[PDB]
Amino acid sequence: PACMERQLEAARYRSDGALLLGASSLSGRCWAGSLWLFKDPCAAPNEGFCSAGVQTEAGVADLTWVGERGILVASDSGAVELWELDENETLIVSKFCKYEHDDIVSTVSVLSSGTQAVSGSKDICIKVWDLAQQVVLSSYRAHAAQVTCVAASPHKDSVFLSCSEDNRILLWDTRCPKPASQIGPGYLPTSLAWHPQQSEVFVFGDENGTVSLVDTKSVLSSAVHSQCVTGLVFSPHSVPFLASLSEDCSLAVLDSSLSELFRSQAHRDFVRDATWSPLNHSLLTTVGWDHQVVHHVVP
Amino acid sequence: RVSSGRDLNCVPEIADTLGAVAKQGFDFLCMPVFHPRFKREFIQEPAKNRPGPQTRSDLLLSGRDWNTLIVGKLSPWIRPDSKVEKIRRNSEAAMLQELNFGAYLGLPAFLLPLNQEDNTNLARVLTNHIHTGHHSSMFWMRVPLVAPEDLRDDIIENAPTTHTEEYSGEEKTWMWWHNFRTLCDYSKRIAVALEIGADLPSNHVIDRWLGEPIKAAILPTSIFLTNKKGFPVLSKMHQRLIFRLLKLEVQFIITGTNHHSEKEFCSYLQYLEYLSQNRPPPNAYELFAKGYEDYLQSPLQPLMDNLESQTYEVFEKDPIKYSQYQQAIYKCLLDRVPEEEKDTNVQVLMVLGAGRGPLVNASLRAAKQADRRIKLYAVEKNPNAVVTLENWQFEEWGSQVTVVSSDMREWVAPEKADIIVSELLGSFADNELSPECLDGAQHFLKDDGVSIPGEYTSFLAPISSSKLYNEVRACREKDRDPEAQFEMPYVVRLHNFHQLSAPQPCFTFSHPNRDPMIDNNRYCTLEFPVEVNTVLHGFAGYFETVLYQDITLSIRPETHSPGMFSWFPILFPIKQPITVREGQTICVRFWRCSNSKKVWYEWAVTAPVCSAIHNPTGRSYTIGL
Ligand SMILES: CSC[C@H]1O[C@@H](n2cnc3c(N)ncnc32)[C@H](O)[C@@H]1O
Numbered sequence: 033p034a035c036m037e038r039q040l041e042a043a044r045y046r047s048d049g050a051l052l053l054g055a056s057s058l059s060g061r062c063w064a065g066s067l068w069l070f071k072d073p074c075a076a077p078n079e080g081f082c083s084a085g086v087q088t089e090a091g092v093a094d095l096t097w098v099g100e101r102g103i104l105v106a107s108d109s110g111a112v113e114l115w116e117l118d119e120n121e122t123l124i125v126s127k128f129c130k131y132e133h134d135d136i137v138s139t140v141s142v143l144s145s146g147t148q149a150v151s152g153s154k155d156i157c158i159k160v161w162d163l164a165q166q167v168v169l170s171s172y173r174a175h176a177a178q179v180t181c182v183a184a185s186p187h188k189d190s191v192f193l194s195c196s197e198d199n200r201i202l203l204w205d206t207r208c209p210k211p212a213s214q215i216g217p218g219y220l221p222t223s224l225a226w227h228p229q230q231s232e233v234f235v236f237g238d239e240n241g242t243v244s245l246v247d248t249k250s251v252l253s254s255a256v257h258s259q260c261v262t263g264l265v266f267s268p269h270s271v272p273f274l275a276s277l278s279e280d281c282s283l284a285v286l287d288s289s290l291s292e293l294f295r296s297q298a299h300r301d302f303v304r305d306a307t308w309s310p311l312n313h314s315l316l317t318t319v320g321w322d323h324q325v326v327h328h329v330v331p
Numbered sequence: 332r333v334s335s336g337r338d339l340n341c342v343p344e345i346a347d348t349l350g351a352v353a354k355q356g357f358d359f360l361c362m363p364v365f366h367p368r369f370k371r372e373f374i375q376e377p378a379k380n381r382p383g384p385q386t387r388s389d390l391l392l393s394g395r396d397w398n399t400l401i402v403g404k405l406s407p408w409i410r411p412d413s414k415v416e417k418i419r420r421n422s423e424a425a426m427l428q429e430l431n432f433g434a435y436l437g438l439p440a441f442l443l444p445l446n447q448e449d450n451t452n453l454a455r456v457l458t459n460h461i462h463t464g465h466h467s468s469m470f471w472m473r474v475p476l477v478a479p480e481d482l483r484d485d486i487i488e489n490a491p492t493t494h495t496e497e498y499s500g501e502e503k504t505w506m507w508w509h510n511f512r513t514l515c516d517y518s519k520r521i522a523v524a525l526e527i528g529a530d531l532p533s534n535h536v537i538d539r540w541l542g543e544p545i546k547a548a549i550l551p552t553s554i555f556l557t558n559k560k561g562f563p564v565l566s567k568m569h570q571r572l573i574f575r576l577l578k579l580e581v582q583f584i585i586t587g588t589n590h591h592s593e594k595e596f597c598s599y600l601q602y603l604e605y606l607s608q609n610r611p612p613p614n615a616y617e618l619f620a621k622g623y624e625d626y627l628q629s630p631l632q633p634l635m636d637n638l639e640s641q642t643y644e645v646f647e648k649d650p651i652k653y654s655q656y657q658q659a660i661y662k663c664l665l666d667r668v669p670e671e672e673k674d675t676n677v678q679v680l681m682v683l684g685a686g687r688g689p690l691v692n693a694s695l696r697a698a699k700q701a702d703r704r705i706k707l708y709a710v711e712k713n714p715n716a717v718v719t720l721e722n723w724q725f726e727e728w729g730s731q732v733t734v735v736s737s738d739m740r741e742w743v744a745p746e747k748a749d750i751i752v753s754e755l756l757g758s759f760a761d762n763e764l765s766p767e768c769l770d771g772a773q774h775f776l777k778d779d780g781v782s783i784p785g786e787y788t789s790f791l792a793p794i795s796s797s798k799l800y801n802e803v804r805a806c807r808e809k810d811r812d813p814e815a816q817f818e819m820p821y822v823v824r825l826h827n828f829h830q831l832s833a834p835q836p837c838f839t840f841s842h843p844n845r846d847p848m849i850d851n852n853r854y855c856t857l858e859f860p861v862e863v864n865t866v867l868h869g870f871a872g873y874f875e876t877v878l879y880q881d882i883t884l885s886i887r888p889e890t891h892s893p894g895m896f897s898w899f900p901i902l903f904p905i906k907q908p909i910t911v912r913e914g915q916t917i918c919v920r921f922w923r924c925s926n927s928k929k930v931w932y933e934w935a936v937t938a939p940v941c942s943a944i945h946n947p948t949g950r951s952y953t954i955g956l
């Protein structure tokens with residue numbers, strides 16, 4: 033832990049306020065990644081003032097917290113990795129590393145119970161994992177192209193969404209003999225985000241820069257960005273806001289009717305992840321491939 | 332030995348990854364030239380002004396490693412046929428960037444995927460890149476046997492996988508390739524990297540790829556079963572496909588992670604070598620023909636041209652062919668000379684076209700085992716071969732053999748022959764003007780004379796081989812018609828091809844010809860029932876001949892003479908390939924034209940589509956009388 037990879041891929045906050053950072057080396061001699069923890073969010077991305085850090089064998093495509101000390105990682109090596117903090121939270125030790133996908137694991141999401149997770153990879157395969165037994169519970173091949181994003185249901189542990197380059201948006205329910213249910217022709221979906229206060233509502237952004245509002249019991253949309261929508265994160269407020277990320281190097285915050293409230297062009301490269309501050313809800317942190325960690329004051 | 336490579340999408344260190352892959356036993360590595368997740372903007376700011384470097388440096392490997400060990404791979408995010416214009420433009424610039432960088436490294440091959448139906452703009456960028464210079468790089472198109480949509484799990488509740496068997500729909504992936512290479516105008520630098528799935532399609536879908544330029548077979552680690560010890564194996568049907576690919580000498584590529592945790596990464600590799608050590612070794616014909624697979628050659632003309640020394644040597648290197656001739660002569664002598672006349676009746680044999688004297692010795696051996704007396708006449712027109720005969724006649728044969736250095740049509744024989752033996756047959760029976768020679772030599776044969784061979788027949792069969800079509804297409808010469816290469820036959824060991832119908836007889840000739848309609852001009856019409864979908868590229872040529880009664884020689888594959896390797900099938904190509912649907916009939920028309928100077932073949936297709944008449948007036952091909 034001395035050189036941090038320039039392409040910052042993910043940024044997530046936890047309960048107390050520590051900042052999780054996942055970077056990848058997308059160019060140069062070595063192509064790998066790293067995991068970092070910043071109890072001082074203002075100190076990021078400087079490595080000399082961090083709480084912990086570890087080097088991974090390959091790049092980091094997508095990660096997410098598993099409670100308060102667990103780190104689930106989707107690696108370019110085709111393996112789903114789990115890293116856990118020690119009792120002192122000074123080291124980041126690898127819990128397990130299972131190579132089950134045959135290509136880059138592109139997306140990963142923890143289910144509601146926190147004991148299981150769903151992983152989407154470029155191998156057109158979606159797998160359900162048991163973090164306790166470190167084994168793959170199920171392996172589904174429902175799509176016909178690269179799995180772009182998978183998002184677990186925030187409260188139903190058997191439900192999760194998935195979108196692939198086959199222009200399919202599938203709603204899953206492992207309680208049924210056929211868990212996948214297609215949702216309704218446009219451009220390919222690229223990001224999925226459930227509504228934090230409505231069980232039957234989610235939003236998705238396409239490769240053309242259009243965020244749409246979808247009701248599960250089958251439509252509102254708006255042209256937010258000029259390129260592919262990378263991520264969609266809801267704010268933790270009572271009436272949550274919608275932060276949208278894109279390859280146009282811009283950040284936008286939408287309201288309930290998908291109207292543009294805040295616009296940020298601070299990043300010079302792609303904007304990858306965005307996380308809201310649990311301590312100050314009006315603060316929103318974003319990272320990108322320009323090695324920047326900007327803290328936005330959302331009005 | 333098996334040339335096998337390792338496909339990867341995650342390479343942290345080229346020096347480390349290449350060393351480990353080599354230690355496992357691989358020959359090359361399929362890796363991306365740029366990071367697969369490293370998208371790059373080319374138009375809109377500020378993402379296009381991204382500071383470099385864009386990828387690794389070429390100094391990380393030697394020029395020999397880039398030329399033999401590394402195979403390029405297109406970035407997955409590159410979508411030249413995207414319905415979004417912005418994504419389409421960036422993909423075009425990115426595709427050229429990665430293709431130009433692969434050429435900068437001198438990579439032997441670059442991988443590009445065929446994963447949907449429309450790859451038009453993808454084909455244009457590649458065709459545009461090919462005509463930017465005259466480099467020597469191969470482009471492997473990754474196309475799966477079964478489309479991912481047709482192999483998905485039936486786990487979508489509101490979109491079930493239709494269980495109705497559709498014949499053409501199961502062949503959709505081949506349609507992708509066919510359209511792609513046609514858009515690229517059959518480029519010699521565009522091959523197929525067939526990717527195999529867990530469930531093989533129906534046998535007709537696999538047969539679709541016969542004759543296609545397959546250079547690589549991709550085998551994921553997921554299609555491997557598990558034995559009792561816990562090692563990767565393959566189903567008996569998958570093994571059946573692996574053996575079919577070994578005959579094409581394709582390069583197998585192992586992709587995917589290690590799903591057999593215990594056994595390390597070399598276990599999938601040894602299993603292929605295990606199958607490669609467990610197959611029937613070549614049989615005489617197969618062994619002699621190794622190296623000439625799909626190698627076009629000009630049909631010999633022993634009449635117009637004088638064959639070289641080693642040309643006759645190849646003819647003599649076949650004992651089965653001459654053992655039949657000796658048998659036929661041995662049989663005819665008994666039927667013509669009864670036992671009570673074994674010491675009084677002497678038969679007059681005339682080897683018409685003796686060459687260096689293989690039939691002369693075969694005649695001497697036949698009269699010995701038959702206990703009959705013969706008087707030999709070795710007639711040969713090639714003055715160089717007469718030197719071998721007259722040297723043979725002085726040292727060994729003697730006064731028994733009478734060498735005649737003349738043409739059999741002009742030679743005035745001193746007496747008439749009881750039997751005439753000749754080997755004036757080519758790969759297409761009469762393509763060496765055997766009828767014209769024996770007809771001219773028919774006057775000095777007794778009224779009850781026997782002709783060996785007594786008759787011969789040509790056989791045609793429609794074939795499909797996009798590879799061989801390119802072979803002929805590449806034979807355009809400077810100072811002649813640009814399409815003449817399609818209007819001339821070729822003697823070739825047919826290998827990477829697909830026979831579309833059982834062969835049918837074409838031209839037949841009888842000797843002695845007693846008919847008052849002495850005319851070797853022929854017009855035949857053939858109709859071939861085609862039970863599959865394919866593209867017609869040409870017609871295979873074979874022949875059968877009757878030496879005497881039941882003694883026969885043949886290159887017709889169903890009735891092929893065993894062990895006789897001294898004849899390769901002939902090939903009559905066509906200018907434009909013709910598409911043939913299942914159930915349709917291919918109607919071909921063949922003419923055997925001739926004037927006082929030359930003899931030639933004319934042919935044309937009339938069903939399902941009419942082609943142009945090939946070689947009219949022998950403008951592109953003639954056999955010298
Ligand atoms: C042994 S392969 C055929 C042989 O027949 C010879 N041949 C072909 N046509 C004639 C002909 N018209 N008269 C004599 N020999 C011939 C060729 O020169 C060759 O040696």
Ligand SMILES: Cn1c(N)nc2cccc(Cl)c21
Binds near residue numbers: 756758897
């Ligand atoms: C005798 N002969 C003639 N005439 N053409 C041939 C072509 C190939 C092999 C042989 Cl042995 C041939």
